[PDB]
Design a protein around this ligand. Structure first.
Ligand SMILES: CC1(C)OC(=O)c2ccc(Nc3ncc(-c4nnco4)c(N[C@H](CO)c4ccccc4)n3)cc21
Ligand SMILES: CC1(C)OC(=O)c2ccc(Nc3ncc(-c4nnco4)c(N[C@H](CO)c4ccccc4)n3)cc21
Lengths: 288, 283
């Protein structure tokens, strides 16, 4: 499927959006159609075990949904893997709230509905995002919401398949060992919890315990008496938003509702939720 | 790792005991002492030899207990790693029950006590066997029982079950207690439960919400102590499952009359199932 041609043949590079250890990301325009796309250039040549890049592109190609970042194709030219994906002009919700500040309850309910639609699709295809957060929710110039960055789920998928699933007989394995061998010890409902933390992150600019050291947070959550977090200010939010947080953050995965069940909740089912709510957020981003 | 010499200098190879992905295992005799050993020849595969050779052999040497199979040394000659270990004459309990048939409750109870002693030692050294089964419990010619054959993300958005797997790994040493319980059923019925079900279908059944721990098929054949030992070792919840030292106080393994003699009686049935001479005239 991968094009073994130079990406500069089909697209014009405009500017560097970001980068890091994995690869640089660029804004680019299609030569024929003029439509914008993002190109993630990954340095791929002497790197061992490229099953992570292989599973990420596979996840992207098979995902066809409005609330999942669209995938256009891939290129291999001069030992660099350029992944062509949907351009989302306003960047991530994190990039936005760092300038605009706290989102409104209706703007958060629109984002939650759009993420839940994307999660119900991923879960129906037997996929787990495993990294739902403001930084992985992209917003385009039309105010549309997209789930992005399946890099964590690709690292987990590649590990729990060949690198950690070359084991014989399950007959003597305890049920907790069987769960790790088959799934990794958890199910798609971990994304529902992460959405609940993301809803707090949009309301308060931080997830709960963000000031606590990451090693200390792992221990608190694993302690027997761990209480799920709640919204700091009570009066500022309606009873529907407090109940959405309460149900998405159910400690027990067996009792936590699914993505399709969460779409019937009042906060998410109310009328008046549309991309206009996020265009109002982007006007605050554009005008000081 | 320890000796960079050819193993044929110190031992005489006699026959191939077995093999597979885990290399080739041979029977061998010491040239000076005449004592028998088992040599596991592993094909090295060029990748790493800083920790993969020095630290791995250091762990193997520092596992010193009566119920863990003994380690003698290692060799690196012609890109092959020969691990010299105790020759356990009678082989594994699987090799034995395939000839003798079902073990008795007292013989199973003895094996369980010896495996529990080996597990309490491994767990105290912060090690997990992870593969307790009849094929990995070796019996030597003296009737002794020896165990053998040894973060992604930021946490603020992780669910508590994801945090538990990231911090504590998804499972602990108590997985060995469950496996011992399955092994006790295996020694009694010649198979672990669900052995006829496809392995892919078994992973799904165990992971399903309503998975019920297995039990002994014949009830009357076994005492209430053996049924309770199975019940208690096969506790679905790892938080409620007892430790190896706690299991040593159980009625089944604490009862009197448990001794090496029970295993010596099992090796006699293995040696004497054949018929005597009838047509051999000779003189
Ligand atoms: C790489 C990633 C996240 O993984 C995918 O699966 C994916 C799909 C489509 C993507 N498209 C896209 N389009 C435009 C912008 C933008 N436009 N203005 C600012 O940013 C943007 N920003 C993100 C968030 O800052 C970004 C993240 C990291 C480095 C650079 C940018 N991302 C981006 C991605
Ligand atoms: C390789 C392994 C299991 O891993 C360790 O840690 C270890 C330690 C000591 C070992 N010593 C040993 N000594 C004698 C016999 C024997 N004597 N008569 C028949 O077999 C034997 N048999 C086993 C079970 O059939 C075996 C298993 C696989 C291939 C060949 C043989 N194993 C064996 C092992």
């Amino acid at each position: 499927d991968i094009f073994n041609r130079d990406p500069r043949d089909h697209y014009d590079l405009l500017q560097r959006l970001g980068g890091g250890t994995y690869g640089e990301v660029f804004k680019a325009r299609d030569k024929v159609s003029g439509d914008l796309v993002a190109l993630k250039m990954v340095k791929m040549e002497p790197d061992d075990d490229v099953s992570t890049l292989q599973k990420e592109i596979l996840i992207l190609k098979t995902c066809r949904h409005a609330n999942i970042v669209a995938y256009h194709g891939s290129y291999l030219w001069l030992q660099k893997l350029w992944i062509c994906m949907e351009f989302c002009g306003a960047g991530s919700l994190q990039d936005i709230y760092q300038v605009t500040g706290s989102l409104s309850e209706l703007q958060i309910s629109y984002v939650c509905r759009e993420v839940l639609q994307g999660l119900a699709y991923l879960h129906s295809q037997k996929k787990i995002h495993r990294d739902i957060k403001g930084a992985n929710i992209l917003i385009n110039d039309a105010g549309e919401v997209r789930l992005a960055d399946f890099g964590i789920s690709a690292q987990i998928g590649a590990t729990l398949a060949r690198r950690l699933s070359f084991i014989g007989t399950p007959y003597w394995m305890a049920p907790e060992v069987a769960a790790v061998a088959l799934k990794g010890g958890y199910n798609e409902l971990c994304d529902i919890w992460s959405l609940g933390i993301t809803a707090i992150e949009l309301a308060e600019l931080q997830p709960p315990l963000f000031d606590v050291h990451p090693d200390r947070v792992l221990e608190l959550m694993t302690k027997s008496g761990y209480q799920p977090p709640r919204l700091k200010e009570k009066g500022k939010w309606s009873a529907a938003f407090h109940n959405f947080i309460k149900v998405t953050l159910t400690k027990s995965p067996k009792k936590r509702p699914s993505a399709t069940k969460m779409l019937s909740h009042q906060l998410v089912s109310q009328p008046g939720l549309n991309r206009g709510l996020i265009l109002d957020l982007l006007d605050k981003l554009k005008n000081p």
